Amino acid sequence: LKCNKLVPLFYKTCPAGKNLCYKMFMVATPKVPVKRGCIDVCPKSSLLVKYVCCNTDRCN
Ligand SMILES: CCCCCCCCCCCCOS(=O)(=O)O
Ligand SMILES: CCCCCCCCCCCCOS(=O)(=O)O
Ligand SMILES: CCCCCCCCCCCCOS(=O)(=O)O
Numbered sequence: 001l002k003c004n005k006l007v008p009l010f011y012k013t014c015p016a017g018k019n020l021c022y023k024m025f026m027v028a029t030p031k032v033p034v035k036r037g038c039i040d041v042c043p044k045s046s047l048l049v050k051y052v053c054c055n056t057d058r059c060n
Pocket of ligand 1: 006033
């Protein structure tokens, strides 16, 4: 699986154990994400802090 980095223009193949891409952002500023990468478990979303998780090459 390939996932995009903070700057979508760049990416990397996920290591063993992390089969999900994620994008972290504040609900009021969806176009200004704060974190992107590979992860093993989709972080829990809250009222203001959301996480987008998917497993399609560079889907984050
Ligand atoms: C002085 C305040 C700092 C503002 C930070 C501006 C956000 C740019 C960081 C790239 C995040 C990714 O964004 S993306 O548009 O490329 O997907
Ligand atoms: C998301 C954090 C980026 C770390 C910046 C370190 C720069 C060194 C480049 C390593 C390339 C090799 O690594 S790779 O993970 O891209 O395959
Ligand atoms: C999880 C739902 C996926 C549906 C995609 C809809 C995009 C949601 C962005 C909110 C718009 C608001 O933000 S604004 O920055 O444009 O004002």
